[PDB]
Amino acid sequence: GLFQEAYPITCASDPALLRSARDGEAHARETHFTQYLIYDASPLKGLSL
Amino acid sequence: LVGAMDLTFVLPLGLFNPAMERFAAHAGDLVPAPGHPEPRAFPPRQLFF
Amino acid sequence: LVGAMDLTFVLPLGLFNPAMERFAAHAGDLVPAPGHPEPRAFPPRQLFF
């Protein structure tokens, strides 16, 4: 309500891009052909849940 | 002092890679089985998380 | 105080990969002899543990 914003969650349009996501954003596949991944930028990043 | 926090998140659906971002990291990865369609090349209609 | 615990486990058999999960993960690997069929492309009838 203040920052006027909404945070991304780790999500991919592929199961195999999303599999890259676990282990953090180092080697995550951020694009493959028309498929895309989005890693987590959110107050929850770095937490477990 | 056990509180609450609301967070809105955001996920894209069906969006589409820009001209430069449609590559693949390497020649062979997430490769289909030998006579197959390579579903990675069509536009994403799904999203995983 | 030396007790016991009962756990039911679960195994799938003969199931079939979803459409997007049927990919190699790299072009060459688990590659048969140059002459042979590469059984990895058929449906699994077995399970190993």
Which pair of tokens denotes residue A29?
A: 């596949």
For A8, the enclosing helix (H) or strand (E) is strand A7-8
d(CA C4, CA C19): 42
Breaks (C-N over 2.5 A) in chain A follow: none
For residue B41, the tally of other CB atoms under 10 A from its CB is: 13
**Residue B3 buriedness (CB in 10 A; 0-12 / 13-18 / 19+):** exposed
The experimental technique used to determine this model is cryo-EM
Count of CB contacts below 8 A, B vs C? 31
User: How far, in Å, CA of A19 to CA of A13, rounded?
Assistant: 11
Q: Are B34 and C38 in contact (CB under 8 A)?
A: yes
SS3 C40: helix
Residues B16, B22, B25, B28, Cα dihedral to 10°: 100
Nearest CA in chain C to A14: C20
- Contacting B residues, span 19-38, partner chain C, CB-CB under 8 Å: 27-34, 36
**Single-letter amino acid, residue C23:** F
Other CB atoms within 10 Å distance of the CB of residue A28: 18
A interface with C, Cβ–Cβ < 8 A, is 14-16
Contact present, C41 and B33 (Cβ < 8 Å): yes
CA B29/CA C28 separation, integer angstroms: 9
Whole-number Å distance between alpha carbons of B10 and A27: 23
B4 touches chain A (CB under 8 A): no
